[PDB]
Amino acid sequence: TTLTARPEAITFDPQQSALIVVDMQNAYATPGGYLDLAGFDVSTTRPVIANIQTAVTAARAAGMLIIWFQNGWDEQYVEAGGPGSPNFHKSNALKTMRKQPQLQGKLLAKGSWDYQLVDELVPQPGDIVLPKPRYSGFFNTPLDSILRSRGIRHLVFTGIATNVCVESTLRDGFFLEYFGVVLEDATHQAGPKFAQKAALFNIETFFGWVSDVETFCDALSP
Amino acid sequence: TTLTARPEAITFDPQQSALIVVDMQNAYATPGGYLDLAGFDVSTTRPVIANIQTAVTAARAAGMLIIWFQNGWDEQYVEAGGPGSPNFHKSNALKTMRKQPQLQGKLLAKGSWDYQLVDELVPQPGDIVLPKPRYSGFFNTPLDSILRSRGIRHLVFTGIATNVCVESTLRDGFFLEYFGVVLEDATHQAGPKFAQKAALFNIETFFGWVSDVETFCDALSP
């Protein structure tokens, strides 16, 4: 398949490719979730959700592997690292719960509402659903092994946050010799609008390719 | 020692810390280098070189290990990967040399002027100088091994490009449980000015700490 993209069009075989849906959890997309409680603007993610559903339908119909990430930890946050991990000190979820003990054990907690995939996005049998304990899906997980076991070299990225979990997984994928493309209108940033712009620029200019959902779906139609 | 920083101050032992000077080569800081020839703006890097000299002097006098990176490859670019690597298709140096054949073998090439550290920055006995074949110093190198072998958990980052090799190495350091701080006035971005602001925003908000050279030197003086 030839996919129109920035900075130029690329080729991939859908049957040797994966669509990765990064962290489409209430924490990252839904009012009252972690990012919202932590002061980030989540009011504009509805079109991102619908666009991911569209992209998943097309990708699965074309034979691409669908991989869903869920970011977060056990309710006791053992897996988040204690004070000896920089993650303990950087996580805005952990910071929010330290400021608001009423939320302690709810943000990004396995089995909780915050951790759930948003209602509109439901993995299907045969999809892979991966928990990850840090922003990048290529650290501390079997993601690389899962992809290599199927000969997959091309990754199409969707999800939240463009500049954090999405971009980190795409950047680390590049260092592991994966070709990564992001569907820009199926992502949303964590931060001001310049964070979306800069993540797309860094991806396009140094790490991978940028396309969009309509272009992706039309490229898959055969 | 307390280092005042964004989003809050941190504490560290300079003896168990490293100052990393990322890719301060002619390619990234000097007129007529790769970045300049590739259309990026390098007209403001003179104060960055000066600020790195100041930070390197304070770091060494405090017992911090100095690590210098040089990004690049053999002159035949075997180490940049062939067409099977996304690096072959993304590297703006390889792009530029395919566009301007007079430059083939001259950009980011071991033994070339482009590849040299800028004249003003001279590694000293006891420092470590490391080549790296991709943007992140934590892939395809012994960097993690070197730091673990000395019990180092705190990394202070300087160099170019803030949003590419600097941020990538800091992000990956975080995934390897390192506490990373960037000295903002000892860096420069590759791209428009929003790429500087956005890299610092991502580091401050999700990955590590932002400080500056004068704050760093003052913190080390006892």
CA angle, residues B167, A84, B201, in degrees to nearest 5: 30
- A66 in Cβ contact with A19 (< 8 Å): yes
Q: DSSP secondary-structure letter at A203?
A: I
- B158 in Cβ contact with B68 (< 8 Å): no
- B159 in Cβ contact with B166 (< 8 Å): yes
B94: closest CA among B56, B133, B52, B152? B133
User: Active site includes A106?
Assistant: no
Please give the residue range of the domain that contains residue A161.
Answer: 2-220
Interface test with A, best of B152, B174, B200 (most A CBs within 10 A): B174
Burial status of residue A221 (CB atoms within 10 A of its CB: 0-12, 13-18, 19 or more):
exposed
Experimental technique behind these coordinates: X-ray
Q: Which secondary structure element, helix H or strand E, spans residue A152, and what is its range?
A: none
Chain A nearest-CA distance from B139, in A, is: 7
Q: How far is CA A47 from CA A91, A152, A158, A213, A219, in A?
A: 26, 29, 12, 11, 21
Burial status of residue A37 (CB atoms within 10 A of its CB: 0-12, 13-18, 19 or more):
buried
Resolution in A: 1.6
Q: Rounded to whole angstroms, how far apart are CA atoms A156 and A167?
A: 12
Helix pair angle (B193-202, A193-202), 10° resolution:
110
- A34 in Cβ contact with A114 (< 8 Å): yes
Residues contacting residue B147 through CB under 8 Å, at least 6 positions apart: B18, B153, B155, B178
Residues contacting residue A149 through CB under 8 Å, at least 6 positions apart: none
Chain B nearest-CA distance from A151, in A, is: 13
Q: Is B21 helix (H, G, I), strand (E, B) or coil?
A: strand
Q: How far is CA B120 from CA A154, B50, B63, in A?
A: 42, 8, 22
Q: Is A121 helix (H, G, I), strand (E, B) or coil?
A: coil
Q: Which amino acid is located at A137 in the chain?
A: G
Burial status of residue A28 (CB atoms within 10 A of its CB: 0-12, 13-18, 19 or more):
buried
Q: What is the CATH number of the domain that holds A22?
A: 3.40.50.850
Residue A182, phi-psi category: left (phi > 0), alpha (psi -120 to 50), beta (remainder): beta
- Choose the catalytic residue: A36, A106, A132, A185: A132
Longest dimension (CA), chain A: 53
User: What phi and psi, each to the nearest 5 degrees, are found at residue B115?
Assistant: -75, -25
Task: Please report residues of A whose CB lies closer than 8 A to that of B85.
Answer: 177
* Nearest C-alpha in B relative to A209: B90
Buried b (16+ CB within 10 A) or exposed e, B12-45: bebeebbbbbbbbbbbbbbeebbbbbbebebeeb
Interface of chain B toward chain A, CB-CB under 8 angstroms = 10, 81, 84-87, 89-90, 92, 134-136, 139-140, 163-164, 168, 171-172, 174-180, 190-192, 194-195, 197-199, 201-202, 205-208
User: Active site includes B23?
Assistant: yes
Tokens 């990373």, located at residue: B180
Q: Pull the structure tokens for residue A30.
A: 């839904």
Chain A nearest-CA distance from B217, in A, is: 23
Residue A126, phi-psi category: left (phi > 0), alpha (psi -120 to 50), beta (remainder): left
B152: closest CA among B134, B130, B123, B176? B176
Task: Please report residues of B whose CB lies closer than 8 A to that of A86.
Answer: 174, 177-180, 208
Domain count, chain A: 1
- A210 in Cβ contact with A6 (< 8 Å): yes
Task: Please report residues of B whose CB lies closer than 8 A to that of A135.
Answer: 171, 175, 206-207
Residues contacting residue A79 through CB under 8 Å, at least 6 positions apart: A73, A133
User: Active site includes A90?
Assistant: no
Interface test with A, best of B175, B189, B194 (most A CBs within 10 A): B175
